[PDB]
Design a protein around this ligand. Structure first.
Ligand SMILES: [Zn+2]
Lengths: 10, 734
């Protein structure tokens, strides 16, 4: 899991 | 009697949905003045403290089962982050009149019999003797317990075993390399630094402690300021005074310490974070009195017991916490996998909370603002300790299930090692024996130890009329409470079965009600329902599209996070998290954006892309973030008023704030609205802003995210709300 504020980030 | 009336509607005739309903109060609680000792609005429980899914209770099981509506209670003991805000009345004479058998507290619904020498318990009908003390210039009717549904008492000695504890805090901070580089440590330290006086210390007894953790557990001995650093490292992960100290007597020293920490681990190259060991350390550090262990981390536990990979130890830890009244809060901020699904069980079963900061990075000034604002408000929030909560029902009613963050095993008692202010809870009620009275009652009691060394008992008494009319049951149904009920059942279904099963449960809740209404109650082919349940279909449908239940792909941590939030959110914020408030700013009324220091907000538009003009400006608020959507065809004048430039492709993109554009009253209004939507005295949430431009890759990704918020629209393979209704109609047909 690479986290990004945007859940739709590739 | 004025039993709420059924107001039939056709769901197909109300599209777009009249979303203004999301803000209307629930159906009235029809209680004639005679049933209340001292009639007033304060004589029955306010929807803010308790909301029954049913305000007209089925007089018997078979009827409850036939309604297909659930029987649950949305309970929220506290309304704000600070107890000084609108507190309920507080008794102090120490007199607590309680029934001998059921133990329910004196309330506005008891009946005084025999010249007022005895009272008949409204929960169990038992005759009780009225203490001569109830009449010592005021009479018994001047008393809160008889005047108010929601009130509080100062508990006598017998409601305490040990002396009220001090508010104890233990900050367990991740000082590993990920933390250093990301700035989480810096941000965490600076925030503590800027809020030591924000931490509640109503009795001057508040105690704090700091544990820094990497591969070993670093302690600190803090001397009294008056007697003016001692870092005690411990690498043996198999293994009080001056460790847990007075925030007041050591004020300068704690400050001196927090200032050095950043330098101490400045060049740390260790990538180990031994949460397990540290956690057990904190446990023994404060276990003798109880308190909060607030964990701040940006690194997956990877050393010592409880390590995780890409565990049941935590559940066992929570079991032990329930023995020494310890609550655990978690602030997880990292770009790497954190396993919110596992770690969130720590908070979940200790009445604490978990806050997740996806992709956190000091490199983004705005990341700091969000983390800091929330962490600060959170540590400043008042709370109770050694608290227990239960709900007693009148004959025939029984509490069967308990939802929310707290500890509960085989009882009807919910243990809160500490009870926060920002969460909500839900109790499912069962009607076993047939009720005989025209009214049934529910009383929630909270035996607590406030963070001011005081022992109190908060009471919430609710009275609901009974009925045998299925029509009357439906007319008094609280749609938002029901939505919440199924929201919790869905979280349970997911967290223990499957996401799909949870979707199935959500859609079914809607079909059963629509099917029941159609067959149990008597044009062309409408989709019938009543006015008070008009938003229900829309809420459940929209729920199925929430990041917590969506079908398809959603990162593990995000999902767990969404589930954790939906399950503890206060009703008000729950409804908005499911269905968002959308504001059309370009054609905003002139009042909007200006003071009435509270700003006026435009009226919300339906959450659908159908209303997004390509030249418009929209603001979406889903309770988690704020999206400023500017149509790719916005006139230069609008692009100007908002960002200063006239080139719409020059606008700021992503997580960024709106610039202060001088001499643009419009820019000020937009900033006012945003700031207004950002202040709440009941939750800690700080909503980051995302600026999105309508129609390089990041831009597409944002449009995608913002778009997903318009839950009325079709997404991939999830139909639109309009189609949803059509599908349902086809299903309940022969
Ligand atoms: Zn009783």
């Amino acid at each position: 899991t690479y986290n990004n504020s945007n859940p739709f980030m590739t | 009697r004025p039993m709420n009336q059924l107001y039939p509607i056709d769901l197909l005739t109300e599209l777009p949905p009249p979303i203004t309903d999301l803000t209307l109060p629930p159906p009235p609680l029809v209680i004639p003045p005679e049933r209340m000792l001292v009639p007033s609005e304060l004589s029955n429980a306010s929807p803010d403290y308790i909301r029954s899914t049913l305000n007209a209770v089925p007089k018997n099981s078979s009827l409850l089962k036939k309604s297909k509506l659930p029987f649950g209670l949305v309970i929220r003991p506290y309304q704000h982050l600070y107890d000084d805000i609108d507190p309920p009345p507080l008794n102090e004479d120490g007199l607590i009149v309680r029934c001998r058998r059921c133990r329910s507290y004196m309330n506005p619904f008891v009946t005084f019999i025999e010249q007022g020498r005895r009272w008949r318990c409204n929960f169990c009908r038992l005759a009780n003797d009225v203490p001569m003390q109830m009449d010592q210039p005021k009479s018994r009717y001047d008393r809160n317990e008889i005047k108010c549904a929601v009130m509080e008492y100062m508990a006598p000695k017998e409601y305490t075993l040990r002396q009220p504890p001090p508010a104890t805090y233990c900050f367990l901070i991740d000082v590993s390399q990920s933390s250093i580089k990301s700035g989480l440590l810096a941000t965490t330290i600076n925030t503590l630094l800027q809020n030591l006086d924000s931490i509640p210390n109503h009795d001057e007894r508040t105690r704090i402690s700091i544990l820094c953790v990497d591969n070993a557990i670093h302690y600190f001995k803090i001397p009294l300021d008056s007697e003016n650093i001692n870092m005690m490292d411990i690498a043996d992960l198999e293994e009080p005074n001056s460790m847990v100290v007075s925030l007041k007597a050591c004020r300068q020293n704690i400050e001196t310490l927090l200032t050095k920490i950043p330098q101490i681990f400045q060049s740390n190259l260790i990538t180990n974070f031994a949460l397990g060991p540290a956690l057990k350390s904190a446990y023994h550090l404060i276990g003798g009195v109880g308190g909060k262990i607030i964990v701040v981390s940006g690194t997956l536990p990877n050393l010592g017991i409880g390590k995780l990979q890409r565990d049941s130890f935590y559940k066992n830890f929570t079991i032990d916490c329930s023995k020494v009244q310890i609550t655990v809060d978690l602030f997880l901020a990292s770009e790497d996998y954190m396993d919110v699904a596992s770690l969130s069980n720590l908070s979940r079963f200790t009445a604490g909370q978990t806050h997740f900061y996806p992709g956190f990075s000091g490199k983004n000034p705005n990341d700091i603002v969000k983390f800091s604002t929330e962490f600060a408000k959170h540590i400043s929030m008042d709370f109770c300790m050694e608290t227990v909560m239960r709900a007693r029902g009148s004959t025939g009613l029984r509490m069967s299930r308990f939802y929310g963050h707290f500890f509960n095993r085989s009882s009807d008692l919910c243990a809160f090692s500490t009870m926060p202010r920002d969460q909500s809870y839900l109790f499912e009620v069962n009607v076993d024996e047939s009720i005989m009275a025209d009214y049934c009652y529910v009383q929630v009691a909270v035996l607590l130890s406030l963070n001011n060394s005081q022992r109190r008992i908060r009471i919430i008494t609710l009275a609901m009329p009974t009925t045998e009319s299925l029509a009357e049951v439906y007319a008094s149904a609280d749609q938002l409470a029901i939505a919440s009920f199924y929201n919790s059942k869905a979280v349970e279904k997911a967290l223990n079965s499957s996401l799909d099963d949870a979707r199935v449960l959500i859609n079914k809740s809607v079909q059963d009600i629509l099917a029941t209404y159609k067959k149990e109650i008597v044009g062309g082919a409408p989709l019938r329902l009543c006015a008070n349940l008009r938003m229900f279909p829309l809420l459940m449908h929209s729920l199925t599209k929430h990041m917590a239940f969506r079908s398809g792909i959603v990162p593990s941590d995000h999902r767990a996070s969404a589930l954790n939030n939906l399950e503890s959110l206060p009703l008000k914020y729950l409804i908005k998290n499911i269905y968002p408030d959308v504001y059309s700013l370009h054609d905003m009324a002139d009042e909007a954006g200006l003071p009435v220091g509270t700003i006026v907000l435009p009226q919300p538009i339906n959450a659908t892309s159908s209303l997004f003009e390509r030249y418009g400006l929209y603001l979406i608020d889903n309770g988690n973030e704020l999206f400023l959507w500017m149509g790719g065809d916005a006139v230069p004048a609008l692009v100007f008023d908002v960002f200063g430039t006239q080139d719409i492709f020059d606008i700021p993109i992503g997580k960024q704030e709106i610039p202060v554009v001088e001499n643009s009253e419009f820019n000020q209004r937009v900033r006012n609205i945003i700031n207004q939507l950002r202040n709440h005295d009941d939750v800690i949430t700080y909503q980051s802003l995302y600026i999105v431009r309508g129609a390089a890759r990041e831009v597409a990704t944002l449009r995608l995210w913002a778009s997903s918020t318009l839950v009325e629209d079709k997404i991939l393979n999830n139909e639109s709300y309009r189609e949803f209704l059509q599908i349902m109609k086809a299903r309940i047909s022969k």
